[PDB]
Amino acid sequence: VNSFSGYLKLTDNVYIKNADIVEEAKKVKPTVVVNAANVYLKHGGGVAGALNKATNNAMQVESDDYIATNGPLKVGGSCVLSGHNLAKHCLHVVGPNVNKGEDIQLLKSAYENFNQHEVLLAPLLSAGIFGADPIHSLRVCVDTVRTNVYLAVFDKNLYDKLVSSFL
C-alpha cells in the first residue's frame, strides 16, 4: 500500500491520473519523481522547467554541478539526483526529442531506467514539447516498465484521450 490517490489502474503495475506532476509530488513526496530531462540537464521548460521552478532553481544548481563533473547524459539514459522539496530522489530520464530529430526507438531504452526503482511518479516520456505521440509513449511505458509507475498527465483533454484509446 502507498499514498497515491485517485489513479485509474491501467495494468498490474501502471496507474494514471490527470494531475500536475509538481502538485502531485508536493503532496505525495514520493521516493522517486521522474524528470523529463535533456542530455544537458537544462531544465528550461516542459515538465523539467516546472519541477525546477518548484525547487526554487536548486535542481538546476545541482544539475549544473553534475554536468560539470560527468558531462552530458545519453539519449535514453538517466541519472539519480536529489528530489529537493518534491521527493526523496529525482530520476532525470532523457527520452528522445522528436523536435530535434532523435530516434523514437530510444524511448524504450529511456523507460527501462524506471525498472531500477520499485515505485515512481512520472510523466509520459517524450510527450509534450519532446514531440512524440503520447499514446505511443503510453504503450511503450506499459510494455517496458515492470515496476510500479504512477503517471501524471497534466492536460485533461490528453488524459481523457489516453484512457479511452488504451488497449
Ligand X SMILES: NC(=O)[C@@]1(O)CCN(c2ncnc3[nH]ccc23)C1
What residue type is 111 in one-letter code? Answer: Y
CA 52 to CA 152: how far, in whole Å? Answer: 17
Nearer to ligand X, 47 or 87 (CB): 47
Min dist. Cβ of residue 155 to ligand X (A): 8
Among 13, 20, 40, 62, binds ligand X (CB under 6 A): 20
**What is the CA angle 93-96-97, rounded to 5?**
110
Among 14, 16, 18, 21, binds ligand X (CB under 6 A): 21
Residues 92-151 that bind ligand X (CB under 6 A): 123, 128
Min dist. Cβ of residue 156 to ligand X (A): 12
CA 82 to CA 91: how far, in whole Å? Answer: 8
- Residue of closest CB approach to ligand X: 50
The answer to whether the Cα torsion of 30, 84, 106, 165 is positive or negative is positive
Among 30, 46, 76, 95, binds ligand X (CB under 6 A): 46
Decide: residue 40, CB within 10 A, 0-12 exposed, 13-18 middle, 19+ buried: middle
- Tell me if 50 contacts ligand X by CB under 6 A: yes
